[PDB]
Every structure is written in C-alpha cells, then in structure tokens.
Paper text:
Protein-engineering methods have been exploited to produce a surrogate system for the extracellular neurotransmitter-binding site of a heteromeric human ligand-gated ion channel, the glycine receptor. Acetylcholine-binding protein is a highly conserved ortholog of the pLGIC extracellular ligand-binding domain (ECD) with properties similar to nAChR. Mutations affecting key residues in the orthosteric agonist site at the α1(−)/β(+) interface affect the potency of both activation by glycine and inhibition by strychnine. We therefore set out to generate a high-fidelity surrogate of this α1(−)/β(+) orthosteric binding site using the 2α1:3β stoich­iometry [Fig. 1(a)] by exploiting protein-engineering methods and the thermal stability of acetylcholine-binding protein from Aplysia californica (AcAChBP).
In the GBP–strychnine complex the tertiary amine is protonated and donates a hydrogen bond to a highly ordered water that forms hydrogen bonds to the carbonyl groups of Ser163 and Tyr166 and contributes to a solvent network that burrows into the protein fold (data not shown). The G162E change directs a polar side chain into the bindng site and this forces the strychnine to adopt a different orientation. Tyr212 also displays a different rotamer, partially filling the space vacated by Tyr205, and this allows the strychnine indole moiety to bind under loop C. The substitutions that were introduced to engineer a glycine-binding site in GBP have however reduced the affinity for strychnine significantly away from that of the wild-type template as well as from that observed with recombinant homomeric GlyR samples.
Numbering used by the authors:
A (entry chain A), C (entry chain C), D (entry chain D): 20 to 225
B (entry chain B): 20 to 225, 230 to 231
E (entry chain E): 20 to 231
Write the structure that this text describes.
Amino acid sequence: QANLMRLKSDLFNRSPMYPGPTKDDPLTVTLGFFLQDIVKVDSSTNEVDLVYYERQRWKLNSLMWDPNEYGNITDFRTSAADIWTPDITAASSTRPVQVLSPQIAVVTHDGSVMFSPAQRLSFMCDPTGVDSEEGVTCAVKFESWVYSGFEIDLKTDTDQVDLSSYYASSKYEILSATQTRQVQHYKGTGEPYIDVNLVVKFRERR
Amino acid sequence: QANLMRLKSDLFNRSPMYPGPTKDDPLTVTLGFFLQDIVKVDSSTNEVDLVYYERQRWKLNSLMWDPNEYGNITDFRTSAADIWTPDITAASSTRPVQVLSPQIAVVTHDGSVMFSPAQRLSFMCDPTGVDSEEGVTCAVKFESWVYSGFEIDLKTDTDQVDLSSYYASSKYEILSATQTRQVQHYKGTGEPYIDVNLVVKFRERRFF
Amino acid sequence: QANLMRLKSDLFNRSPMYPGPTKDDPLTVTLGFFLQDIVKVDSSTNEVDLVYYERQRWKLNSLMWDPNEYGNITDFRTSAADIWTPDITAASSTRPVQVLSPQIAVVTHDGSVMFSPAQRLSFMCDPTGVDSEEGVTCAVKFESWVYSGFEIDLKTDTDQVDLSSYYASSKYEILSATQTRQVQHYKGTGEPYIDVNLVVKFRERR
Amino acid sequence: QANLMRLKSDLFNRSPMYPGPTKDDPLTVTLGFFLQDIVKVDSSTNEVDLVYYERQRWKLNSLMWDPNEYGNITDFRTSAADIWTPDITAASSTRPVQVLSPQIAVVTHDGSVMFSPAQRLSFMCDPTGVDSEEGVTCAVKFESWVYSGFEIDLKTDTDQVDLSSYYASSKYEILSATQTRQVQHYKGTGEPYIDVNLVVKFRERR
Amino acid sequence: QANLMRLKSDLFNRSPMYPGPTKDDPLTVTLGFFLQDIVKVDSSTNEVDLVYYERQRWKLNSLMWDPNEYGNITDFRTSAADIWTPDITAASSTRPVQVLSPQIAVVTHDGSVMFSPAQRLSFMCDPTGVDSEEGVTCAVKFESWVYSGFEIDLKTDTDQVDLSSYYASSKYEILSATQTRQVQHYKGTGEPYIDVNLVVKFRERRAGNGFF
Ligand SMILES: O=C1C[C@@H]2OCC=C3CN4CC[C@]56c7ccccc7N1[C@H]5[C@H]2[C@H]3C[C@H]46
Ligand SMILES: O=C1C[C@@H]2OCC=C3CN4CC[C@]56c7ccccc7N1[C@H]5[C@H]2[C@H]3C[C@H]46
Ligand SMILES: O=C1C[C@@H]2OCC=C3CN4CC[C@]56c7ccccc7N1[C@H]5[C@H]2[C@H]3C[C@H]46
Ligand SMILES: O=C1C[C@@H]2OCC=C3CN4CC[C@]56c7ccccc7N1[C@H]5[C@H]2[C@H]3C[C@H]46
Ligand SMILES: O=C1C[C@@H]2OCC=C3CN4CC[C@]56c7ccccc7N1[C@H]5[C@H]2[C@H]3C[C@H]46
Ligand SMILES: *[C@@H]1O[C@H](CO)[C@@H](O)[C@H](O)[C@H]1NC(C)=O
Ligand SMILES: *[C@@H]1O[C@H](CO)[C@@H](O)[C@H](O)[C@H]1NC(C)=O
Ligand SMILES: *[C@@H]1O[C@H](CO)[C@@H](O)[C@H](O)[C@H]1NC(C)=O
Ligand SMILES: *[C@@H]1O[C@H](CO)[C@@H](O)[C@H](O)[C@H]1NC(C)=O
Ligand code: NA
Ligand code: NA
Ligand code: NA
Ligand code: NA
Ligand code: NA
C-alpha cells in the first residue's frame, strides 16, 4: 500500500485537478451503454425508466506514471471525487438521474481513465404500441451539457448497445438497442457539438 | 491545461467570490426559457409538472481577463460552486425544484457568465379543461427570492419561450408560451421587484 | 463590491457566530405567515399539505454597522448558513419540511435580520367535513424546538395570516386563517414556552 | 453572548470530541418516547408509520463546567453536529428514518446532554385485526447499532410511552404503549446487549 | 476516553487511509446477509424490495495495535468515513440502496474491520408464481464495482443466509435463502472477478407447511 499511497499522493496533492478540455487541448471521451433493464413505462405521463451502466473512457497526460517508480503498479481505483469527470447528461430525462453504483474510477499508468456509473433514468418516451408484436421505440441523447465539439468529442466503439446483462425476466423484451454518435449545431455560439443517441426498441414480453 | 489552471487560480483563489449586487452597484440578469415537456398534470391537487432549461446571463468586471495573458483563452467552463449565481426561484412551485443537468457555467473573457440549468418544476396550475380544444393557461413567476429591483433587474431577450426542444410526443401540446418581465411592488412598501412571468397555454394532444 | 466584501469579512471572519440566546440575553423572533396553497388533503391518513412562506425577524447587536464606514451600505444579502437562525419548527408535521426557496437572508445596518423561507409542510389534520359549506378547521403550532420562553420569545405583528399570495385556483378555499401567540408549559423543566398557532379554516372550492 | 462563546470554545475547540464508550468506561443512555401519531398502516406490505419524538439523555465529565466561571450559565443549546450522539437505531425499520425537528441538543453544567429528535418511522408491523375492538399489537426494538452492553447500557425513566401529544383525531386510537429495557445475548456468545422495546397496541378510531 | 483518543489519533492522523488493494497486496472481504423482510413485490415492474443487513469483514495490518499500549482496549467503533470501506454493490438493484443503520464500523486490535450496514434494496425479480405452494426464486449478485479478482476476493462464512431476524409476520415466507461465492469472467477479457450470489426462494405466507 505504501507505493500506491505515494502514487496517489504524487498525482493528486502535488498539483491541481485537470480543469477540463479547451480548444487548444480538446478531449475525446468514449461512451458505451450496457442496458440492464427497462423497469417501467408510464402511459399517463409518457415517461420510461431504464437501468443501465455507462462506460466512459478518456486519457490525460497528467495521470501517467511509470510503473517502475511505484512498485510496478499499472493501475489503481480511486474516488471519482479525486478526478475530473465529463459533464455527460441525458438531454431528455424527466427526473434527476439516480446513481446505482459506487462513484469510483479506474486509472491506468498511461493516463487512461475508465468510469462506469450505473444509473436509473426516467426519460421522455411515449410507450403507445409497447403491448404489441412490433413494440415501440424510444430515444434519448447523451451530451456534454456545456462543452462544444471544439472541446469535447464523444465517440462510441460500436453502435450496438451491450445487452449481455439485460435482465432475462424484465417485463420488457429488447428488440434493438443502438448508440449513435451525431453532430448537432448550436445557434447561440454557431458551434458544433456532439451527442450519442441511445435508441431502444422494446415490447411487453410475450 | 496550464494556462486555464492559472486563469482559474487567478480568478477564484486570489480573491473572494462576488458578494452579490447592492443598490450602488445593481445587476441585470437576462433569463430565457427552453421548454422541453409538460410531463404531468394533477387535477386532484392543481399541480402541473414542467421540464425546461433556463438560460441565465449576467456580467461581472471581476470575472474579466485579457486572453493574451492566458494562452488566448476566450472562455471556460467551471462548476457553478466556484461563482456567485442569482437566487432566481419559481414563486408558486409546490415542490423543491429538481436539477436535471450538471451545475456548470460558461465564463467569457469579458466577464459574461451563462448558466443554463435544466429543471423539473411542480407548480400551481388548474388543469380543468385541458382535455378540450381551448386547453388551459397557467402561469408562474420567476424572481430573486431576496433582492429587490434596486439590486437586481431581470430581463428577457425575447417574449417568446423557446419551443424548439419541446417534446413532440408529450401528452400535452403547447399552444403558446411567453415569458414577460413584470415590475411588482411588495405589499404597501412601494419598493419594486422584478419577475419574469412564464405563461403557458396547453392542451391534451389530439385526421390525427 | 469591495465595501460589501469588507463589511462581510468584518461581521463574519473577525468574530464567531452568534451562539444563540441565553436566559440573560433572550431574543425576540417575530413570525408571520404568508399562505400560498392548501395543495392537498389525505382523508385516509389525516395529513394536509400547505405551501407558504414564513417571515422571520430578529435583531442582533453583533450584526450592526455604521453605513458611513461602508460606502453607505444599509443592507445586504447572505447565505443563511453564514448566520445563526432560530430553530422554528412545526410541532405536528408528519414529514420533513421541504424547502421551496433559496436559503438566504437580509441583514440591515441596525442588526435586523429578515429570513423568509418558503415551505411545503405535511401536518396532522382531519379534513372530515372539507366538502361542506362550513368547512373544516386545522391547526399547527410553530415553536423553537429546544429554547424556552426565557431564551426565545415569539411574537406576531398581526393575528391575520397574510393571504395576498393564496393561489386563486386552489382546490381549497380559505375561510379564515390566524396566527396567534401562545404560552405553554412543560413539567420536565417548569419553564414556559412560546408557539405561534397557525389556525386555518377551509373548504373545497365552490 | 461572550460568556457563552467562551464556554463553547472551551468545550469544543480546546479538546476533541468524545470518541464513544469503552469496556473500561461504559455509558448509560436513557430513552423515552413521546408518540404523536400513527399516520398510516399498509396491509399489503405489513409496514406501519409512526410519528414521535425520542428523548435521549446521557452524561459526560468532559462536558461539565462550573457556572461561576461562565457568568452563571447553567445550560446551553448547541448543534448535535458539535457533540457525540449515540447510534441508537430502530432494528426493524423498513425505510430510513425521517427527521422532523432541528438537530440541536441541550447541554447542562453537570455534563448532561438531552437530545430529542422528532422522527417518522416505517417499521415492520402486521395490522391484521386493527379494525376490531381488540386492535393489534406491534413492536420495534431500539438499540445501539454497534455497541454491546459492555460499552452502552440503555434504560428508561418510565416504562410507559408518553401519550400527552398523541394526535386526538388520528385514524388510530392507542390502547397501550410501552417502552421496556431488555437484555439480549448475541447468538451463542454470552455477550449482552440492550434494547428498549417499543410496544404499541392500537385500533381504528370508533 | 483518553486511551481511545490516542489510539484513534495514532491510527488515523499519522497516515492516510488505506488506498485499497492492488495486485501485489490483494484483499479478502467476507460478506454475510441477515435477511429481515421481503417488504413488497411489484408484478407490474418485476421489482422486489428486501430489508437486510450485510456483515462485511476484512483485515488491514495498518489498523493493528498492541492493547497493552492503549489501556487494554481491544476494539473500538468509529464512523465509516474515517476508514476505507469496500465498494460492494448489488449488480441488479433498480434504485439506490437505502441506508437503515448508522454508518459506523468496529475495528479490532488485530486490525479486523466489521461494518454491518442495514439496507433496503429494490432489485430485479419477476415474482410470477409467488402465490403458489413452491413460490418463486430470485437472485441478486453482490460484487466489487471496480476491482477484479486480482485485487479483491469475496467469500461467505457459510452458504445459508442468516434468517434469525427475519420478520415472523412478513407477507412473504422464506423457503430458502443462500449466499454463494461465484467466479465470473468479464466479456472475452478472460479476467476473473468474484460475486456473492444472494438467492432467495419465497412465497406469499400461508399458515401450515403449504404442501399437506
Ligand atoms: O454553452 C452552452 C449553452 C446551452 O446550454 C443549454 C443546453 C444545450 C445543449 N447542448 C449542450 C452543449 C451546448 C453547446 C454547444 C456548443 C457550445 C456551447 C454549448 N452550450 C450548450 C447550449 C445548448 C446546446 C448544446
Ligand atoms: O419584505 C420583503 C419580504 C418578502 O420576502 C419573500 C420574497 C419576496 C421576493 N422579493 C425579494 C425582495 C422582496 C421585497 C421587495 C421590496 C421590498 C421588500 C421586499 N421583501 C421581499 C418579499 C418578496 C417580494 C420581494
Ligand atoms: O429542552 C427541551 C426538550 C424537549 O424537547 C422535546 C420537544 C418539546 C416541545 N417544546 C419545544 C421546546 C421545549 C421546551 C420548553 C422549555 C424548556 C425546554 C424545552 N425543551 C423542549 C421539550 C419539549 C417541550 C418544549
Ligand atoms: O457480533 C455482532 C454483530 C451484529 O451486528 C449487527 C447489529 C447488532 C446490534 N448490536 C451491536 C453489537 C451487537 C453484538 C452484541 C454482542 C456481541 C456481538 C455483537 N455484534 C452486534 C450484532 C447485533 C447485536 C448487537
Ligand atoms: O472492464 C471492466 C468494466 C466493467 O465495469 C462495470 C462493473 C463491473 C464489475 N466488476 C468490476 C471490475 C470488472 C472487471 C473484471 C475483469 C476485467 C474487467 C472488468 N471491468 C469491470 C466490469 C464489470 C465486471 C467487473
Ligand atoms: C496567442 O497569444 C499570443 C501572444 O500573447 C499571440 O502572439 C497570438 O495571437 C496567439 N497564439 C500564438 C502565438 O500561438
Ligand atoms: C455616500 O454618501 C456620501 C454623503 O453622505 C456621498 O458623498 C457619497 O457619494 C456616498 N459614497 C459612496 C461610496 O457611494
Ligand atoms: C453570577 O453569580 C455570582 C455568584 O453567585 C453572582 O455574585 C453574580 O451576581 C452573577 N454574575 C453575573 C455576571 O451575572
Ligand atoms: C491492562 O492489563 C495489564 C497487563 O495484563 C495490567 O497490568 C493492567 O491492570 C491493565 N492496565 C490498565 C491501564 O488498565
Ligand atoms: Na439531463
Ligand atoms: Na448497483
Ligand atoms: Na420557490
Ligand atoms: Na435501523
Ligand atoms: Na417538526
């Protein structure tokens, strides 16, 4: 533990936290979604509730070390409060997102950070058709709330959402789940910005 | 990262935070509303629930910098915790407002701040008749909870609430939505305060 | 801005916080209620929900200054966390009081503090009869939770609850609403204690 | 104001917080309940909700002073955050307990602390028979969550719950309410630990 | 109080907290569930709610002391904020776990830590057949959220869940409940990680054994 204590001390107390990207030094965050459950549907308010975890990855030079200097430690875990995290938000949620896992991130000696918050989200979705063979499709965009595409880029590794942890006895069966990067335009600043649109097609289990 | 670290350190550690406006140095805050959804109506309690974000803009001399001394940085993002923010509140909500976005603001080199919190609001609104062609009208005033018109002025860039992100499959269709500055006076004091009145006319969604 | 900064540092950093009143320096807090809505009634649990705001006022010598020493500043606003505030509570609430306003106070150069929290309160109230012409009466006492009448006195400017912001399209119509100082007793110390009794008579709107 | 600030500084700043009891110095905590309302009953989940305040009392040498050194102050009120408080918990609650009053304690010159939190509690209770002349009985134990009887003893000043603030128009009428110290032994350890059993027999109001 | 204050000062104020385990100093955490109640079942959303506490136990050399040097104190209690705690999470919860107990741990002189948080948990469970004789079975896996099997091992003291504080008048009777260590592997990555699988077989209560 002494070497990990040194490393954490060297990375966190010896300088300020990363202040976020800039135009001069923009940042790529990769996202993927792992969908666990569609919990419920409210046809009186057109809200659907999802449970998923969201893998976020990025890389900072300020978080690199040489494993040789610290007992060959090649990665560690630390509170998400110790580091900068991207301001990724659901654009059409109808309640504050609920946090379902520990807010802890993994940091690798090359400066890669992996943060995988599990979340319960209520979002804008009209579920009319869900009690049918064809089912229903809803979507919700994830984006940095404040950064433009000059500062933050969002990427995915695959446009296919991971269903390997989807609850087999959910009330709702998944027919398709995609995560698609998109470039939007903001009129206020004239600048592009990026979202990942999560689109889920689902039906009441037969 | 270096220059941005320096800028933030210079602005936030090398002085205390803006203490808010006074009568000798008043402040103008511009507001506008981007209405996203009428989620829910409750005809048993006369409460309606709205999702929207609120664009807030103000300018402070103490937040200005010369980009040439900071690697040509012209703006940055920072947590709303690092700066003063106006105490704007819905005057007729029935629940604590829920925050739906990161509490982060954009600060520009001229000292302009833009802060755009997304919110869910339950407020006082009689939905009797919302299942009709004419729909219903409800209104909610936004104001500083503690500052009068001698310290804080509120204004809008437009009268029209922005409906470009309004949810197309909401249970409720928006018929109109306006945001209007009003000058009020508190009880018998004759002392002025300003609000922005959010008036929304809507009906149950509907040939189709 | 700098004069206000100086004032606040002089008041808050150069002395600790007011420790609360004592038998020998008791404090008077004036309360007034501004009723906004009876939001709902639950006849199966005998709980009624009110929205109001609560004007609180008190005066401390430690918060006085001379406006001429501070660029003619006569009043300022500050976070209620920066100052002492009285522990006024509804004695028969059935849920934690929910806060509907910014927790900021107004301080005037004579040492007067005004704090006006808005609140949603569930409290004990049998609404049986609300659907008639005569209506129903319910009441709730507000008091310091830990101070006696020897440390904290409560007073009202007026017996009449202010209804100038009562919602005109409330499900419930206010027939009368008073706020009346009362003196109480308690055999655990014998000391008197003060409450403001909010008495509201209402019915379903016609 | 000044004597009180000096006293509070002497007690809280000049020394750290009481760290809790030990086998060598055990601590007796007295409890007493003041039952305000049975707010509701859920027969589909066997949960009942009570509102009450719970008087907690203990005594620490470290909180003593001589009134003559502090201008004859014989007591004061302070934030419960300033002092150690016992970790008493309802052992069969079904929801986190909701705090209904300011978390402020009374400290006396002899080192006695009195802390009286108002609370709403959902707990495990089968209300079958509540609508009958006999009514129903439910119980919940209150105990230290982490201390044995070697460190903490609990007791009551009376075995009768105080009903003098019980809500007179509650849906539920109280037939008896008792509070009784009990000595338990953990599994096969022989190690004692104490609880106060709150037993309430109630029925639907005639 | 003085001997305890010294002890706490020497353990917490002279060094930082345990930073967690690493591949070269891995940690074993022991978990035990004490099931108190199945509070409700929601057949419209396939969520069930449990009340339980969860005994967690682990041992750190950095929290050891000689009782001789501290007035024979052999253990103490302290706020869970003062120490490292393991990031154990239920993997199929559908709401944030609700905390029902004070967040305080017990630390012994050998450097053992025992933290027993009382919880209400909603989790993914299809209750279809819960009204029958044989009832229904649901499962929830508990695991470190960020550590793999190279840094954290989880085990149980025994496979039977402790039912000695299960509510005698719950709406639901427990037919069995077990807590079993499992080895998983993440995706195709080949890399192990451990869970404790909480498996509860339950039915709506009926008086008598229900099969006669
Ligand atoms: O600086 C802003 C302000 C505004 O905030 C409301 C939310 C918005 C949704 N996304 C999030 C990032 C944002 C954007 C793009 C490019 C530069 C700045 C920037 N934002 C927000 C903006 C809109 C549009 C866009
Ligand atoms: O006298 C008051 C108290 C009252 O407090 C509740 C909140 C209010 C919102 N704003 C903040 C300042 C205030 C106002 C304006 C002019 C003189 C007095 C005065 N205040 C508050 C008042 C209302 C209205 C207004
Ligand atoms: O010191 C106390 C403790 C006790 O706390 C439970 C609630 C109570 C209701 N009111 C609030 C103030 C109080 C009171 C009156 C006179 C001196 C001290 C004092 N309090 C509380 C008391 C009871 C009674 C009373
Ligand atoms: O060994 C234990 C663990 C168990 O933890 C859950 C909470 C409990 C409440 N109190 C706190 C101390 C305890 C107890 C008493 C005597 C020896 C061991 C012991 N504890 C906890 C125990 C229960 C019961 C009791
Ligand atoms: O690659 C990952 C990411 C993923 O993150 C979500 C949470 C998980 C719970 N534990 C924590 C460590 C982890 C794991 C084990 C072995 C290799 C990679 C790996 N992780 C996480 C993983 C799951 C599963 C497992
Ligand atoms: C940034 O600022 C410098 C000097 O302050 C100026 O010469 C130029 O316009 C900008 N960028 C450079 C030189 O990269
Ligand atoms: C304050 O009032 C004085 C006269 O009483 C006046 O000369 C001056 O303009 C005011 N000062 C400030 C700083 O506003
Ligand atoms: C305090 O008590 C002393 C001793 O009985 C008494 O003489 C004096 O009147 C009191 N002092 C103050 C400052 O109130
Ligand atoms: C602790 O134990 C020692 C050695 O067994 C014994 O001599 C003594 O009585 C105890 N010391 C204290 C300080 O209580
Ligand atoms: Na959002
Ligand atoms: Na989880
Ligand atoms: Na408000
Ligand atoms: Na508990
Ligand atoms: Na209260």
